[PDB]
Design a protein around this ligand. Structure first.
Ligand SMILES: OC[C@H]1O[C@H](Sc2cccc(Br)c2)[C@H](O)[C@@H](n2cc(-c3cc(F)c(F)c(F)c3)nn2)[C@H]1O
Length: 138
């Protein structure tokens, strides 16, 4: 494969029990990946693996409101590897997004943007070959 950056519409927004699955392969020498769950121009949930931030690998999560980034939430557990296939699962739960990579729980991100049914796009960007992006209800 799909063209990156990729826009996955989320019709009617998100809701608890909605599971998003992204399959792809990290490029060689990757620098960054981003998932952006968007409410119009706002980013309700930005999930941003950084492969080299001051020679450390970190996942940065945040929200963008009126073009302003908020307080970052950082996770040093880093399950991505340059050149390797991955699976990201984002499960919408009532009070957070719950993210697992390669079937292992990674992090939760508490809902800052509370109008879940207005979070109606997912952008997928960065240094990946994107194989598929889809959703289902569990
Ligand atoms: O807080 C989160 C943000 O941090 C910095 S801005 C910043 C600086 C200091 C303190 C605080 Br608070 C915020 C970022 O520049 C910002 N970002 C990343 C991408 C991006 C685009 C792509 F196309 C892509 F592929 C990708 F992977 C990422 N766009 N914007 C976002 O990550």
């Amino acid at each position: 494969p799909l063209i990156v950056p990729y826009n996955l519409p989320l019709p009617g927004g998100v809701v608890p029990r909605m599971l998003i699955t992204i399959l792809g392969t990290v490029k060689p020498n990757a620098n960054r990946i981003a998932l952006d769950f968007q409410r119009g121009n706002d980013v309700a949930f930005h999930f941003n693996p950084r492969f080299n931030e001051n020679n450390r690998r970190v996942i940065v999560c945040n929200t963008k409101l009126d073009n302003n980034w908020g307080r970052e939430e950082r996770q040093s557990v880093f399950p991505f590897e340059s050149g390797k296939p991955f699976k990201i699962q984002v499960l919408v739960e009532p009070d957070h997004f719950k993210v697992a990579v390669n079937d292992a729980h990674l992090l939760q991100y508490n809902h800052r943007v509370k109008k879940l049914n207005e979070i109606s796009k997912l952008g997928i960007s960065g240094d990946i070959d994107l194989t598929s992006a889809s959703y289902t209800m569990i």
